[PDB]
Design a protein around this ligand. Sequence first.
Ligand SMILES: [Mg+2]
Ligand SMILES: [Mg+2]
Ligand SMILES: [Mg+2]
Ligand SMILES: [Mg+2]
Ligand SMILES: [Mg+2]
Lengths: 171, 72, 137, 191, 234, 197
Amino acid sequence: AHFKEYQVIGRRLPTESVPEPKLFRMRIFASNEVIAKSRYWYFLQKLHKVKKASGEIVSINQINEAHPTKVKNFGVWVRYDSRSGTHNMYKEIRDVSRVAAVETLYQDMAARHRARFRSIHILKVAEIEKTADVKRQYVKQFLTKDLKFPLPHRVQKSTKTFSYKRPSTFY
Amino acid sequence: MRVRKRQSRRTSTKLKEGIKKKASAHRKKEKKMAKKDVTWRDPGIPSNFPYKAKILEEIEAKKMKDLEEREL
Amino acid sequence: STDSIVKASNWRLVEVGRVVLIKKGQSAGKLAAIVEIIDQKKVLIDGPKAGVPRQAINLGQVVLTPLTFALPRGARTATVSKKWAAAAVCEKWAASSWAKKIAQRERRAALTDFERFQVMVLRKQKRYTVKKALAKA
Amino acid sequence: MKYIQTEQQIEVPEGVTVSIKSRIVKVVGPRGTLTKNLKHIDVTFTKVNNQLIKVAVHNGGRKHVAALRTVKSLVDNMITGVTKGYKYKMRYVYAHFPINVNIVEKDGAKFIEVRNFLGDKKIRNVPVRDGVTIEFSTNVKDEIVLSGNSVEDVSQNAADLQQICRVRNKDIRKFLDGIYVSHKGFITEDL
Amino acid sequence: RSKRSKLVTLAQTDKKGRENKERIFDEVREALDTYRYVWVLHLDDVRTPVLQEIRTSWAGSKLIMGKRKVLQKALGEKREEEYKENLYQLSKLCSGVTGLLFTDEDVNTVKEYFKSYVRSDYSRPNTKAPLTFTIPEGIVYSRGGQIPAEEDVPMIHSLEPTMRNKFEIPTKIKAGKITIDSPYLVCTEGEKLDVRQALILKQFGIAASEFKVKVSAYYDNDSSTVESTNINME
Amino acid sequence: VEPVVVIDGKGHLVGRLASVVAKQLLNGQKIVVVRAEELNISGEFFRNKLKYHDFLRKATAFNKTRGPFHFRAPSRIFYKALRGMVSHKTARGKAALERLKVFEGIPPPYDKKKRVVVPQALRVLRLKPGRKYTTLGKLSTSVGWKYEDVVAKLEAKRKVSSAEYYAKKRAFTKKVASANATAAESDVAKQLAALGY
RNA sequence: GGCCAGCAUCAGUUUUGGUGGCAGGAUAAAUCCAUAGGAAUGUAGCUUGCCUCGGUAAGUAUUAUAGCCUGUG
RNA sequence: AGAACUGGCGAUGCGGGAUGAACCGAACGUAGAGUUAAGGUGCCGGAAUACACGCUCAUCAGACACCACAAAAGGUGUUAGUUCAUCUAGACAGCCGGACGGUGGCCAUGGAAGUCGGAAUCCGCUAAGGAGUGUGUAACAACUCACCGGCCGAAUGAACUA
RNA sequence: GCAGUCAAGCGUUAUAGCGACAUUGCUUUUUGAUUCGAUGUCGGCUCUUCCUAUCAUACCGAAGCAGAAUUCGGUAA
RNA sequence: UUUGCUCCACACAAUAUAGAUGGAUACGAAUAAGGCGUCCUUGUGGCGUCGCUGAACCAUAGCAGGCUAGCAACGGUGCACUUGGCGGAAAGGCCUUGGGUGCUUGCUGGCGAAUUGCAAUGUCAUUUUGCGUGGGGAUAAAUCAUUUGUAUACGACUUAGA
Ligand SMILES: [Mg+2]
Ligand SMILES: [Mg+2]
Ligand SMILES: [Mg+2]
Ligand SMILES: [Mg+2]
Ligand SMILES: [Mg+2]
């Protein structure tokens, strides 16, 4: 669906002589909190030796974009599950929000790489402060000063089956 | 300009069901060969990631901290 | 007359300061300004005078208007409001035949039945005068 | 990729007027006029000054920008054609049977008539395309000159003349008779 | 896909990297301290036997070639990056195919040698014609009429396609010999030469033009001044 | 909204036009299609010609006169496209097909009638620019239709007459618009403007 | 009183709208305001080259005759 | 192919998969109303020629069974990745110039000079230049390219993956 | 076909194990010399059509293809 | 085959079935371009203006549209005539002259409507192989049977005969 970002903080169950186990936080992109918690347990078991049965979720909070009406460039570092192994991929996405950039990235992985949400891992989404660190041409072409472009061949949606006039594509 | 015969793409029931049996046999054979065979069993930071230096500095500081975390 | 001549084909341009009219969604029929370009298919718009919130919108949801005004790139909502008022975008829009067609459509949709009767009577009177003028000339 | 905007420049000299409308290019120069239909290609022409014309593609791909460079080359060839002309010199050679090349008029249609190619009784007739002039070289043996404004017309006429005299069923290591393009160039040689 | 495919050759020599530029840079900056006079020489279109003869005649000195930007960076491009005081003037005086002569001899002796050194050379394009040459009528010979045809040997037939296409000379093969129907004038004296005419003259072996080193200026180590020489700069 | 809808087939795409016309006929609308020779099929001319030669391959082996009947005219090509989208072996399907007429050119009486377009089937609105397309007249001529030149000459004559008619109508439009302008300053016109007319 | 219907007020099931009062979260994040810094896809101004009566190319210049970004409240 | 356990079908209609023993839904008194499953919504055909981000043009695309043809092979189609390298003391492409000296290195041949062959393949001067990458000559010549420089001026090349 | 050799890849930190392309041995040796068990269905005549995996006819490309003739290949029923 | 046949008007008569219920309301071409208006030195010209849907334009008030009085104007509109021109793609229609005869809601007045009972399509639009009135126009063929043989199984074909 449309993505939200959550911080999920969990821990092992306290035992005898071991109070206050270490708290682990993870940033998860998901459609809702049930999916977010599921992905968190998946990664915690994949990385450490912690199971959902032996642990608990301490906190889960939605994280909002700080400046959702500011256009930013994002470097996205991902890796996808494969027979040859984990494969790094770096992409650049221009958008106003991290969740919008991640939604674009998932749609793009489905379109080009034929990849699914369960197969894609997000390693890091970072905002590029300076425009000189942008290094993909399909993003750098939109960083030109006084950028103006037209939209040739305008196709207007018709509400009726028949039109009494030949259409125009002018804009 | 003589046009030849084109192969039909209409599905055949017998072929479809036979391919189903073929695929099940193939998967079972592959699983058996996987349980039988004797063949021995971290790409890191991408070169185009801009904050490579920050990632490396953080991993080095983490290593230095973890070196003394377990000792004391 | 020995100079080359090439036809121009003036296109309305996607650029900062371009006035757009929104055609579908929560703010349909309202004017906003393009504040920044995201990509070929999406821009950022702000509509502070009309009540359009600052938002990223798809270009398939607005129509570019011929109007444009001076605007810094990425300018915040209050600055957009100030520059919009200074450029007097609303008046230049209201003077257009596009805006008049919109308002005429709304008034015709808002007429009552008694008013439609009045309209027919007036049309008949105007028709009588126009035909009489058309006979002499 | 889908580049946002890709453009090329076309330089217009002083004696040349270019009129472009709905992708029909007319170039008028000291040697005459040429016309081209470019309506099979989506481009936009813009006038920057009297000496410069831009041709541009918006939101194009690889095939589109390849067409853009093709368009620029074609219009430049028109400008060269109306300002300097095009001139192809051909030579016809033979071993034993002399080749007879003349200009003949069949109802005022202006054919090049080629006779006695390897002793053939067949008369080969190559029509002259419109706008192409045929001259026979003075004080040069067995040379034809094809001249005109349209390089496409001149080079296609030269190709027709070269292909009408193919050697058939014979070893071409041995049999060398034919008509061959010997030089491609311009008409005017002010410098 | 659809890109130009580079040709692959199996030869015995590899390319030079940045290390050779650094090596020549080091040699320049060492010779600046070692020798006293640094002369800037222009040596465009010079032949290697001539250059090696020059190096031999200046035994005990140093002649250094290389990339002009490398030489200028070694001498110092600007005032704050120069290797020695007021060397940037000599550095910016370099142009074209540049050689540096590090020496210890007298200014008069270096000037006299470079004023008196001259050798016969092929005529380059965009140069004045030193003579008016014409291939004589009939069978084309190797020298093309400079020596008598009885001494001269006829031109080999393998050069006929080169003469016909590249030089645009009307030639025909008769009995394995290259023949022209009429005399062919190649160049008239005092006329600017293009690539085609220069190639024709080089093919026939006519060397009437003169070669001479150009001397721009020199820099003195202890005096720390540059003096414009203006030798053969006409 | 008309009893009879006259559709100008020029510049339309065959399948999308056939789909809309089939649905309109089944809902009970009378449709006349004119200028079937200027219709378009997406794809390059050799592709569409190859498809027609595949159709020409099809025939009943023991008696060719029983087989699929290969009509070469552009109107019949469009009719085949449409009949494939109508359930034509039922009485309802036949009754629907009998609400349609298809013509090459614009014969009388339709030449003095209004002709409309279908925007969801128009080539300049549907095809991405640069994609190749075929024209039905050339396709029909290559596969055996023999009346392209006759229809072209008749279309030229009709265009001359229609152009003269439009010149007269335009002059009258100018006169009526002029005389209507000078009544815009009266109280009646002000009241009409207040009401929206 | 036999046949077929219309409207109103209800009951059972259900479908489709308008509108109000509340509660949570970073007690939304934003916008907006104030303040402290900062940079360019460098605003005004100033220098120079030589340019269609000043419109430009390249340096300085951080708010100025535009503005933007970050933290804090 | 031999064992063991568990389902489905025969005795069983209904919706869908165009059609159908084992496929996807769902099991059945007679009706009405509402809502769905699986599958679908250009037209045949009830239901958006809906909205959104990308990819693809096939001289018989694809809308299929995830088995085979299939060598993860071939391709100067096109898109996105990854890892290496070169680069304003000058990227790639082009044009021009240099491309030398001992030396026609030794043996061999009627001839054989880098370039029919067999073995060595060195030394000097360099900015660089093979006892020579090919064209060429009866042998030389000439051309070439390996390599270097001048002009030009900002990105480029190679191998892999999807 | 069997047995081997090489090594682009696959594989991996344990030079184990797979493995395309190439390649060797046997079959099969040097001077162009000098019929061996189908165990169960086959063929005519008349007449039509289809495939192309083309023998001829048409047009092309390559070859020491002089010419003549031939060989190999492409489109083509 | 007891005046058969066909049209031109005035009465009665019946009728209007893949679906009337204000009007199918005519440039052409382009779409990386056009429409309209205006001006010039008439062109690939200058200037202006339009689109972003027909949500239009034209019609549209009166017992399903009655009866009457005026005012303003020389218009609009129906019918039957008549003047001329054009249309062959299946023209069967488009334009036009003149007078006559009705209406006109362009504006101001005076009478009428009811009871179909609170809705029930509440019946409204061309052509008419029918008849009675009539003034005008035109008075044929084909087949069987007989016959020929250019034909032929039979039919059919092709000939001939007041
Ligand atoms: Mg209720
Ligand atoms: Mg439907
Ligand atoms: Mg097979
Ligand atoms: Mg074949
Ligand atoms: Mg009344």
